[PDB]
Amino acid sequence: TPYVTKDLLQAKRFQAQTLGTTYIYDFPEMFRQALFKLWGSPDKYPKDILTYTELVLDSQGQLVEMNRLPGGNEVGMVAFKMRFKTQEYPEGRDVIVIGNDITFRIGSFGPGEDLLYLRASEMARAEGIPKIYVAANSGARIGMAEEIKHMFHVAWVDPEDPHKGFKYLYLTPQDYTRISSLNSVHCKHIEEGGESRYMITDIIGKDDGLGVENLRGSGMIAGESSLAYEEIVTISLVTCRAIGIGAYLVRLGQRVIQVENSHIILTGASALNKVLGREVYTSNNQLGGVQIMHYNGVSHITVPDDFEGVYTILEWLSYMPKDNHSPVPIITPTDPIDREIEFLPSRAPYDPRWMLAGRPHPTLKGTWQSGFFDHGSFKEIMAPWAQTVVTGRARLGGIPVGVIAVETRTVEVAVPADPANLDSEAKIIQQAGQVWFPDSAYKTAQAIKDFNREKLPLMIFANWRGFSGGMKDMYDQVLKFGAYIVDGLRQYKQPILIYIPPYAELRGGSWVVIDATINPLCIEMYADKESRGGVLEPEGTVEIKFRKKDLIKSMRRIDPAYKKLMEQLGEPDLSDKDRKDLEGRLKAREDLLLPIYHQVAVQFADFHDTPGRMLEKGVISDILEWKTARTFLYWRLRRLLLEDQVKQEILQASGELSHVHIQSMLRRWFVETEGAVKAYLWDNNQVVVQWLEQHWITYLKHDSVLKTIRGLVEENPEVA
Numbered sequence: 001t002p003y004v005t006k007d008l009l010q011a012k013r014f015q016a017q018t019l020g021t022t023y024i025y026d027f028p029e030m031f032r033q034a035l036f037k038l039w040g041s042p043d044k045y046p047k048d049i050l051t052y053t054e055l056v057l058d059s060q061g062q063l064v065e066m067n068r069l070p071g072g073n074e075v076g077m078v079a080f081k082m083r084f085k086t087q088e089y090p091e092g093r094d095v096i097v098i099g100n101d102i103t104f105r106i107g108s109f110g111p112g113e114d115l116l117y118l119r120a121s122e123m124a125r126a127e128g129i130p131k132i133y134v135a136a137n138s139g140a141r142i143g144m145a146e147e148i149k150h151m152f153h154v155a156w157v158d159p160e161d162p163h164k165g166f167k168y169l170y171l172t173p174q175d176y177t178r179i180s181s182l183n184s185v186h187c188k189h190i191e192e193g194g195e196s197r198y199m200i201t202d203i204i205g206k207d208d209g210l211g212v213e214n215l216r217g218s219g220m221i222a223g224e225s226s227l228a229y230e231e232i233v234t235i236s237l238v239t240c241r242a243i244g245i246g247a248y249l250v251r252l253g254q255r256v257i258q259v260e261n262s263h264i265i266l267t268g269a270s271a272l273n274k275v276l277g278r279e280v281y282t283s284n285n286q287l288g289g290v291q292i293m294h295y296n297g298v299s300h301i302t303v304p305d306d307f308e309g310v311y312t313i314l315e316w317l318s319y320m321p322k323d324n325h326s327p328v329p330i331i332t333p334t335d336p337i338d339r340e341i342e343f344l345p346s347r348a349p350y351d352p353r354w355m356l357a358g359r360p361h362p363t364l365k366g367t368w369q370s371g372f373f374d375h376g377s378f379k380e381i382m383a384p385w386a387q388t389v390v391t392g393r394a395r396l397g398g399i400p401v402g403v404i405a406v407e408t409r410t411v412e413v414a415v416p417a418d419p420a421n422l423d424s425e426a427k428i429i430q431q432a433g434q435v436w437f438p439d440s441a442y443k444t445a446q447a448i449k450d451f452n453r454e455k456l457p458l459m460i461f462a463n464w465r466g467f468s469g470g471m472k473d474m475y476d477q478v479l480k481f482g483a484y485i486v487d488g489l490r491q492y493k494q495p496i497l498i499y500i501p502p503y504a505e506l507r508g509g510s511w512v513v514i515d516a517t518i519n520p521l522c523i524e525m526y527a528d529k530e531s532r533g534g535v536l537e538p539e540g541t542v543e544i545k546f547r548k549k550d551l552i553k554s555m556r557r558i559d560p561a562y563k564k565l566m567e568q569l570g571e572p573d574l575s576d577k578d579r580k581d582l583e584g585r586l587k588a589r590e591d592l593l594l595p596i597y598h599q600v601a602v603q604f605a606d607f608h609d610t611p612g613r614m615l616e617k618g619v620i621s622d623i624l625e626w627k628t629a630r631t632f633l634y635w636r637l638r639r640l641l642l643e644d645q646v647k648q649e650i651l652q653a654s655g656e657l658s659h660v661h662i663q664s665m666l667r668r669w670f671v672e673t674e675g676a677v678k679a680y681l682w683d684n685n686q687v688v689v690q691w692l693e694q695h696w697i698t699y700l701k702h703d704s705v706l707k708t709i710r711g712l713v714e715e716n717p718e719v720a
């Protein structure tokens with residue numbers, strides 16, 4: 001119709017719709033639409049909720065910010081710089097959005113496409129802001145020298161019988177004359193059958209972007225993506241498909257959102273079928289669809305469509321700092337800090353998500369039974385992979401945290417059949433709760449690294465009996481993956497709060513890999529009054545330390561009947577007949593008592609495993625009560641976050657100062673400005689938070705600068 005407002009990109013939109021995706025130039029508007037929903041209702045939207053520019057390569061291969069009509073791209077990659085207003089950043093946060101244009105040479109990657117990705121990614125890193133990559137591509141571009149394809153000739157073994165084969169390919173002198181100035185081929189001049197021929201030894205092609213230069217280009221952007229993951233927030237959305245380098249780019253950014261019915265693949269199904277010589281695979285989704293990648297941790301989450309993908313991106317960003325040199329964004333909670341937790345962990349197995357997010361009340365219908373974190377704030381990732389562990393993000397009185405919790409129910413995992421292997425059939429496997437398997441140790445380590453790079457505090461609801469130590473799980477390298485937990489926690493740069501909840505336990509190798517001493521500056525450990533911790537289970541401690549001999553020694557000491565029989569069996573003047581009767585009765589009594597005296601010993605061992613011993617031995621900071629634990633940990637975390645902002649300011653003014661020195665300094669400054677009578681209030685987290693907020697070093701700076709300058713002249717006697 002002539003009355004609506006239309007651009008000239010209708011054909012591109014349609015082409016994108018046919019491939020099951022969104023035209024790249026329509027993504028900015030999706031973000032705006034997603035931002036509005038994220039905000040709520042049209043009563044208090046800000047003025048310019050989203051402003052953006054297109055990032056365009058100039059003649060020198062540098063990016064310039066432009067405001068131009070959509071669809072003007074000369075390479076099959078597009079980039080935007082976007083500023084949007086959110087609850088976390090009402091005055092704006094920036095991101096870089098980079099995306100393949102799947103309507104431009106099927107989203108293949110050539111030199112120009114690679115250069116734009118590189119430059120946009122470099123710009124995200126230089127400014128310290130998140131890089132968002134929209135993946136809809138066909139991998140590295142494939143070409144042939146079109147100007148040679150229909151001019152070459154064949155030197156047959158026998159021109160009257162071509163199935164005998166051919167000796168070489170060649171160009172006639174007339175043809176060589178047409179292309180010798182174009183740098184298209186390398187030829188060797190020869191004579192045969194009395195005719196001059198230009199024998200082909202190499203085909204170069206006069207057009208750029210045919211072959212290996214496309215692989216160099218792919219490697220270039222793989223390296224850049226590897227680096228970006230280390231420096232800034234990286235997120236990808238997979239829509240339609242991600243192939244080859246496209247698949248590696250999404251993996252290297254780590255945080256992957258995959259649209260349902262898309263695929264992440266290296267080589268495709270029909271290619272593999274041709275190589276293997278039979279119809280093995282039914283579909284690319286079979287190789288790299290959500291049912292593979294959501295189930296193995298490559299995909300953090302799945303969405304029904306592009307729009308939910310974009311919305312998901314904004315939700316993830318809402319937990320994260322606006323850039324890599326900013327504090328985590330703490331918002332005003334609506335869920336009160338000073339409330340108890342209504343859901344109570346039990347000895348009986350429960351879904352750990354209820355403890356985090358709460359749940360519908362079991363009896364009082366229409367009511368929510370609150371969990372630990374702020375209502376509605378817990379959002380899980382890598383859910384269907386390695387289900388004995390739970391990983392996600394949440395808010396505690398408004399503070400964004402990474403979250404690790406442990407499943408207590410037995411897990412049923414469906415392992416898919418291998419289509420390439422005749423006798424392989426589908427299996428169901430069971431994984432015991434409260435255990436690290438190779439898969440869940442890996443998921444745990446991954447999550448730790450990802451959250452560290454988002455700069456989040458980490459909350460670990462510890463509940464592990466140990467690692468799976470059986471032959472299969474040992475063969476499958478459980479040991480390698482347990483070690484990554486150590487590396488990950490060691491490298492953590494933000495506070496880590498470890499809490500063993502009611503009826504949870506921390507034992508053996510599971511304690512070891514998460515102990516506070518791995519990162520004494522970040523990690524604090526807490527145990528519920530109803531928790532347990534020790535090298536073994538009490539049943540195991542008894543097996544090693546309180547065996548049959550010891551159980552007998554116990555009966556002798558405390559069972560009246562057993563005591564008498566031993567004392568009767570003492571007398572030497574005793575006949576052979578009385579001796580056989582007494583020791584018969586002693587064995588009878590022994591057999592009646594072993595089972596329960598065994599339980600007594602188990603309880604004896606159980607009393608060594610208490611939070612009480614934990615505290616007395618200094619392996620935890622405090623014993624908590626679940627109902628009031630949300631409140632306590634809120635203030636502890638606030639305090640730790642604030643003390644760290646100060647402590648890092650102290651170090652940029654005097655880098656030499658040890659961490660024990662600084663702790664004493666902060667305490668000293670508190671005592672000066674409140675008085676020695678109030679020094680005990682340093683142990684009060686709420687009071688210290690308030691004090692730091694009211695009081696928000698110059699002298700330290702003077703001395704360290706003067707020390708730096710004296711050193712430089714000491715080391716270099718010229719200069720002055």
Ligand SMILES: CCNC(=O)Nc1sc2ccccc2c1C(=O)N1CCC(N2CCC[C@@]3(C2)CC(C)(C)OC3=O)CC1
Nearest residue numbers: 142266267268269270271272273274275276277280287420
């Ligand atoms: C000799 C005739 N060889 C072939 O027929 N190779 C072919 S047929 C074909 C058809 C469509 C697209 C690509 C290819 C293709 C090709 O060049 N590929 C690149 C190499 C790819 N393989 C790389 C090594 C690993 C491999 C796939 C091979 C295999 C071990 C079978 O399983 C795989 O995943 C397969 C596709």
